[PDB]
């Protein structure tokens, strides 16, 4: 009765898409020249980790990059000189996500423990110590990126997300729309809206001001592993276990182009766009990463060399280089 | 040549590398295990045999030293029924101690399905599973009472026969022996269906009043380490 009505609405939404789906992105964008064959070479090999690396994030200066190892270590590597700057040991060994604050003064991390603990990097004494613990979730922290020097969003495995204040450490805005465990999130350039993917083959947009689900996107056949906004902020790519990446536009409210290949039957673990967005770097479980054409779906490059599953992939703010971290306990930077 | 800041940076990197190798020493010296099981499996009692923080905490660690070897057992706490995501985080643990209550014929199918899923998992294919058939006294009492038949849930039990490889304990009814060996073979068949020699199962008959569990865990971890060192060289 409220379940039948609901499905009716679905049809309506679907019908709306049928009114906006005039042509396909591959059709309208066919005359442009191809990107060619981008051959990215390895320039830096950061070694020293003990256990499998699980996450990383570049800094605003494009110099320091944080990486998390489930042995309980957050290492901040200087990508230029490869010199280890900070090595923070974690109380909880199982860490699954890390984030570098935009100001470069704090670094957040989380994992199986329901706490996205933050550590200060610019203490008056020069050492690192526990600054604040954001506890309260009933699931493992999938990702908690920094929105500002005071507010921080955190996605948990309890099918909900929460916005905390570093000062007080209390939930300021709660999001309980997702039905499955939230696996990844991606903020917008203006930090006003952010998309989040869950294990229900559905992505959801959320406004940090109001805190309500304004748009919901579907199309995937399995759990969405990675999600990353588009450099312009109007679209976002999502990679799931179905060995297929899908680009969804917020203004069109429908998938534009699909990235997949018969030879690829493995799930996606990482996704990232270049400074221009023409190239989409997606990490797969086949020990390699693929550089697809956002406007042509053509695989331009195959970054190989890793001996284990790719865990994280991060492009610099200036689109200069991309750092890929796998379970082999080594990171590789391609430029 | 280099700048004055480069010297300090290199010294800091050297100190951090020294700290990292010092930590790796202990990391390789200590072993890690993953405890799994249902609510009735009695994980609390086995965890309470550790003889050597937050309410919503999702992981509990227990460190115990046996024969000068440290073992850290990790058990998920506040977590939902879905486990296909975070379980992949334990694709490098030493062993997985899976508990089952052998006396509960109702949920025995659920335990078998969970064991099959954990065995056939893509990321857990290279990890051994230590099966502790806890609560043997309850199983013996239920078998001696005869109020619940096993063929109601597993018809093959009607055709099962006590294997000569068995080791009956002194003063044990043959019925209890055959029942426990059947519920052990139920898991061993699934284990061997996709073993491939890369991982094996270690079944043991344990109960609530049992202190040798630590010795069994130590011996199983030692055997797993021996097998790993053998496969590393290819002698395997």
């Amino acid at each position, epitope marked *: 009765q409220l379940r039948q009505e609901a499905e009716q609405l679905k049809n309506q939404i679907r019908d709306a898409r049928k009114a906006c789906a005039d042509a396909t992105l591959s059709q309208i964008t066919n005359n442009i020249d191809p990107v060619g064959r981008i051959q990215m070479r390895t320039r830096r090999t950061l070694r020293g980790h003990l256990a499998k690396i699980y996450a990383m994030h570049w800094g605003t200066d494009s110099r320091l990059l944080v990486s998390a190892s489930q042995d309980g270590k957050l290492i901040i590597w200087d990508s230029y000189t490869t010199n280890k700057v900070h090595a923070i040991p974690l109380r909880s060994s199982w860490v699954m996500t890390c984030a570098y604050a935009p100001s470069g003064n704090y670094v957040a991390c989380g994992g199986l423990d329901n706490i996205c603990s933050i550590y200060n990097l610019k203490t008056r004494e020069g050492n690192v110590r526990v600054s604040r613990e954001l506890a309260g979730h009933t699931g493992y922290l999938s990702c908690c990126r920094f929105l500002d020097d005071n507010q921080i969003v955190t996605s948990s495995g309890d099918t909900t997300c929460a916005l905390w204040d570093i000062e007080t450490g209390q939930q300021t805005t709660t999001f309980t729309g997702h039905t*499955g465990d939230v696996m990844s999130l991606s903020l917008a350039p203006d930090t006003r809206l952010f998309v989040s993917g869950a294990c229900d*083959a559905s992505a959801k947009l959320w406004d940090v001001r109001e805190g309500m689900c304004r748009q919901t996107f*579907t199309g995937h056949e399995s759990d969405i592993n990675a999600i990353c906004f588009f450099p312009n902020g109007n679209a976002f790519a999502t990679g799931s276990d179905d060995a297929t990446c899908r680009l969804f536009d917020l203004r069109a409210d429908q998938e534009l182009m699909t990235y997949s290949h018969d030879n690829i039957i493995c799930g996606i673990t990482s996704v990232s766009f270049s400074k221009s967005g023409r190239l989409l770097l997606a990490g797969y479980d086949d020990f390699n990463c693929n550089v697809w054409d956002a406007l042509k779906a053509d695989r331009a490059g195959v970054l190989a060399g890793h001996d284990n599953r790719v865990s994280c992939l991060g492009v610099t703010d200036d689109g200069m280089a991309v750092a890929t971290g796998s379970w082999d306990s080594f990171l590789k930077i391609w430029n | 040549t280099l700048s004055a800041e480069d010297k300090a940076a290199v010294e800091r990197s050297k100190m951090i590398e020294k700290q990292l190798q010092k930590d790796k020493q202990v990391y390789r010296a200590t072993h890690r295990l993953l405890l799994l099981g249902a609510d009735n499996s009695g994980k609390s009692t086995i965890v309470k045999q550790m003889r050597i923080r937050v309410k919503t905490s999702g992981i509990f660690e227990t460190k115990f030293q046996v024969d000068k070897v440290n073992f850290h057992m990790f058990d998920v706490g506040a977590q*939902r029924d879905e486990r*296909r995501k975070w379980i992949q985080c334990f694709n490098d643990v030493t062993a997985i101690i899976f508990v089952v209550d052998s006396s509960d014929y109702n949920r025995l199918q659920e335990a078998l399905n969970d064991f099959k899923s954990i065995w*056939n998992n*893509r990321w857990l294919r290279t990890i051994s599973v230590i099966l502790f058939l806890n609560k043997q006294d309850l199983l013996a009492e239920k078998v001696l009472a005869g109020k619940s038949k096993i063929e109601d849930y597993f018809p093959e039990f009607a055709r099962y026969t006590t294997p000569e490889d068995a080791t009956p304990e002194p003063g044990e009814d043959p019925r209890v022996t055959r029942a426990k060996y059947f519920i052990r073979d139920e898991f061993l068949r699934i284990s061997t269906a996709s073993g491939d020699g890369r991982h094996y199962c270690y079944p043991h008959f344990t109960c609530s009043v049992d202190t040798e569990n630590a010795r069994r865990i130590f011996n199983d971890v030692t055997d797993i380490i021996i097998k790993m060192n053998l496969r590393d060289c290819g002698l395997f």
Partner: nanobody, 125 residues
Framework: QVQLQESGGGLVQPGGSLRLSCAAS????????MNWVRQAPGKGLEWVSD????????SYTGSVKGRFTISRDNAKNTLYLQMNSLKPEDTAVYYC?????????????????????RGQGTQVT
């Protein structure tokens, strides 16, 4: 979107038979491992049977092993389940679950209370 609609459930006396049919949409039914579970009044999700992609590998729970037959139809992307020798214990809501990832033998969370890749099920009594 992923959708699984089950049909064929109804009232039947002991010893009868029922042909449950589940129609799937939103994914390649031929590249996913399927399972049939059941939940009875008061009890939890109980696994009934399981079938692979092509159908060569099939498994049934010992409680119903010998009277249930599961099958797939890729030409129509349908899951059929023929149940015979029904008994009062079979009164329950039957659901159909799909494996989380394709080309995987393991099927986790199939018996989980919350599972997105699962239909509404049909009540049999």
């Amino acid at each position: 979107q992923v959708q699984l609609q089950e049909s064929g459930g109804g009232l039947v006396q002991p010893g009868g038979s029922l042909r449950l049919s589940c129609a799937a949409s939103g994914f390649t039914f031929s590249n996913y491992k399927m399972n049939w579970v059941r939940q009875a009044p008061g009890k939890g999700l109980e696994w009934v049977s399981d079938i692979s992609q092509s159908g060569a590998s099939i498994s049934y729970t010992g409680s119903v092993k010998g009277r249930f037959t599961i099958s797939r139809d890729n030409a129509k992307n349908t899951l059929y389940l023929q149940m015979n020798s029904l008994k009062p214990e079979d009164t329950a809501v039957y659901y159909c679950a799909r494996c989380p990832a394709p080309f995987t033998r393991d099927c986790f969370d199939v018996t989980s209370t919350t599972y997105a890749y699962r239909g509404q099920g049909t009540q049999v009594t």
